[PDB]
């Protein structure tokens, strides 16, 4: 996260770290959506241009974390993966269209002060909240700059951007399965996701019921925090039918 701040303890209890077994290192962010299911970006697991194709046994999920590098004894919980499901129409060839994946845990994780699931949006909450100017929150342990790394989980609040402005900021083809967020050059403030924040959540706090909803998944950006560029996020509600199909079939 570029130009963010240290998270407060328990501020993002759905935050998940995807951890590589060997070598031991951060792979991506992710989020907890139930006691057995974790949501992430497809490109965290499958990205052929970079020779990335992880299998279940390659990875661990670490839940309840705050410190990036420490083993947080008595606080974090580490889970093995039963199965990975990647969207069948994930487009890694062009623009990361439908950049979404689910991971089922081998055993249910116990909830605690530090571990708790985020809500997924219904059509109505999505329609109400996914509006230009409305701010969401992005969290992760990714790099602090495009070109170092944080001691603890970072957080940044960013405004959703008008679709034509998103489109005009890039030569990449944008789809309805994405939205973009970030400050414009003339707005003074800044901030973005960066390398390592991939797969983490873009959340919004509903003013209707005071619950946090995951509206997006950290997906892609041309660099990190560049003037005139924006971060692009997987549109979670647009892909919710697939999410539900997977959970209903394999749950």
């Amino acid at each position: 996260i570029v130009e963010g701040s240290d998270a407060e303890i328990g501020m993002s209890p759905w935050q998940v770290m995807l951890f590589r077994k060997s070598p031991q290192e951060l792979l991506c962010g992710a989020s907890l959506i139930s006691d057995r299911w974790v949501l992430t970006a497809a490109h965290c697991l499958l990205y052929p241009p970079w020779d990335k194709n992880f299998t279940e046994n390659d990875l661990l999920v670490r839940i309840g974390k705050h410190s990036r590098t420490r083993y947080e004894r008595n606080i974090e919980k580490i889970s093995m993966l039963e199965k990975i499901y990647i969207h069948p129409r994930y487009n890694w060839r062009e623009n990361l269209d439908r950049d979404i994946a689910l991971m089922k845990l081998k055993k249910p994780v116990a909830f605690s002060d530090y571990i708790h699931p985020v809500c997924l949006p219904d059509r109505e909450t999505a329609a109400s909240l996914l509006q230009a100017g409305y701010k969401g929150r992005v969290t992760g342990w990714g790099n602090l700059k495009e070109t170092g790394q944080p001691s603890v989980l970072q957080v940044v609040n960013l405004p959703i951007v008008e679709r034509p402005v998103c489109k005009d900021s890039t030569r990449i083809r944008i789809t309805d399965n994405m939205f973009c967020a970030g400050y414009k050059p003339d707005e003074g403030k800044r901030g973005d996701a960066c390398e390592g924040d991939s797969g983490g959540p873009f959340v919004m706090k509903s003013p209707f019921n005071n619950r946090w909803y995951q509206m997006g998944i950290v997906s892609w950006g041309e660099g990190c925090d560049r003037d005139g560029k924006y971060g692009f996020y997987t549109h979670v509600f647009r892909l919710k039918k697939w999410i539900q199909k997977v959970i209903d079939q394999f749950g």
Binding site: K21, Q24, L26, T69, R70, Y71, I78, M80, Q149
Partner: peptide, 11 residues
């Protein structure tokens, strides 16, 4: 840079 995690999670 990462602190070693308990072995049982690697088995």
């Amino acid at each position: 840079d990462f602190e070693e995690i308990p072995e049982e999670y690697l088995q």
